[PDB]
Write a structure and sequence with these properties.
The structure is cut from a larger assembly and holds two copies of chain A.
Chain A: E1 9-11, E2 26-27, H1 29-34, E3 41-45, E4 53-59, E5 69-71, H2 74-77, E6 91-92, E7 102-107, H3 113-116, H4 119-129, E8 137-138, E9 152-158
Parallel strand pairs in A: 1-5, 2-4
Antiparallel strand pairs in A: 3-4, 3-6, 7-9, 8-9
Bound molecules: phosphothiophosphoric acid-adenylate ester.
The site of phosphothiophosphoric acid-adenylate ester has 14 residues of chain B, from α1 and α4.
PDB class: chaperone
Keywords: Ribosome biogenesis, AAA-ATPases, single particle cryo-EM
Entry title: Structure of substrate bound DRG1 (AFG2)
Chain lengths: ~160, ~180
């Protein structure tokens, strides 16, 4: 009888963050089966006693990933201030978040987002993200000049 | 009549002789557990007002710290000379503030020995947060958490700290309690 660990260990996600893998924190498939969690499904990741954060369940390689380790794209770790070695509490979600109607997007240093980067690349990142809660970061974003790193934080999202 | 706190009766309209009275309390012979009030503990006015502030800030206006962001004062230590009225003030806060009072911690706990008591305590602070704005009193905080003079300890002191570090969550979410200690 396989034993489900009570607390999982946060670790890097060797895959890049620019892709559609923002909230698709890869989880060891054995844990996915042992917790009645379907692939590509939403589940709550959070530190012990804290309110949960939403991640999408995606199956990883059994051999490479040990059982405890949960891999997060660096965009979502910054949502709930998840620093490495933070013990988590995986639980199964039950409500699908509704779509978005308005999003107010921030920046690290107040740089004019209109003037520095295209709306198309920002929209690409945001769409490929899929589910957006207020607090992530999209890092290492190539700008129009190609020599500037500006990070897209998200201040708020409102549904009408 | 058995176990009734005061003699009950059934109202039936028309057959009952209703009468007015200026009396602010029920018949004294009912031996009721009469409320406790600030009209009784008066004599410490300024600290009463400060206590009222310390109940305003964590019960009524926790939202008003989400803006301004800064960590709130969500632990109170009502110290003073023995017999000065500390337990009476805690009792008046409990009955005249309309928060939910999480049960008194007390010197007593299941076993009063480390390991066993560590879970039995955390349960009291786990009961906190879920209920609408509350107040967990830890009276006699010197008897539950003594000084550790040179080596006198079970685990209870560090257990209180480790639990208070989660009880201090609030005003971002679950800002629905304050802790008031008393000591001599
Ligand atoms: N207005 C008053 N102010 C202060 N004490 C009063 C007052 N009226 C009556 N007393 C009584 O003074 C006694 C004070 O006892 P406590 O409040 O239990 O003492 P205390 O300050 O809590 O000391 P301990 O050692 O910490 S239990 C109670 O019996 C009160 O009812």
């Amino acid at each position: 009888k396989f034993k489900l660990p009570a607390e999982f260990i946060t670790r890097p996600h060797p895959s890049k963050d620019h892709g559609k893998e923002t909230c698709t924190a890869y989880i060891h498939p054995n844990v996915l089966s042992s917790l009645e969690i379907n692939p590509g499904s939403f589940c709550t990741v959070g530190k012990i006693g804290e309110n949960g954060i939403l991640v999408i369940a995606r199956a990883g390689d059994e051999e490479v990933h040990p059982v405890n380790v949960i891999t997060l794209s660096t965009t979502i770790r910054s949502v709930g201030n998840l620093i490495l070695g933070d013990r988590l509490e995986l639980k199964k979600a039950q409500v699908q978040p509704p779509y978005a109607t308005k999003v107010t997007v921030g920046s690290l240093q107040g740089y004019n987002i209109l003037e520095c980067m295209e709306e198309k690349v920002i929209q690409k990142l945001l769409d490929d993200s899929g589910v957006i809660m207020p607090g992530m970061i999209f890092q290492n974003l190539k700008t129009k000049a190609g020599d500037e790193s500006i990070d897209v934080v998200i201040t708020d999202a409102s549904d009408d | 009549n058995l176990f009734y706190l005061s003699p009950p009766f059934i109202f039936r309209k028309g057959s009952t002789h209703i009468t007015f009275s200026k009396e602010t309390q029920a018949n004294r012979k009912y031996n009721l557990p009469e409320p406790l009030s600030y009209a009784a503990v008066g004599g410490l006015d300024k600290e009463i007002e400060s206590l009222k502030s310390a109940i305003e800030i964590p019960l009524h206006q926790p939202t008003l710290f989400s803006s301004f962001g800064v960590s709130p004062p969500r632990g109170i230590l009502l110290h003073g000379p023995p017999g000065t009225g500390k337990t009476m003030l805690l009792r008046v806060v409990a009955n005249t503030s309309n928060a939910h009072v999480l049960t008194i911690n007390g010197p007593s706990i299941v076993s009063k020995y480390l390991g066993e008591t560590e879970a039995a305590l955390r349960d009291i602070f786990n009961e906190a947060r879920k209920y609408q704005p509350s107040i967990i009193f830890i009276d006699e905080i010197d008897s539950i958490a003594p000084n550790r003079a040179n080596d006198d300890s079970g685990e209870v002191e560090s257990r209180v700290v480790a639990t208070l570090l989660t009880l201090m969550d609030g005003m971002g979410a679950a800002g629905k309690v304050v802790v008031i200690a008393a000591t001599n």
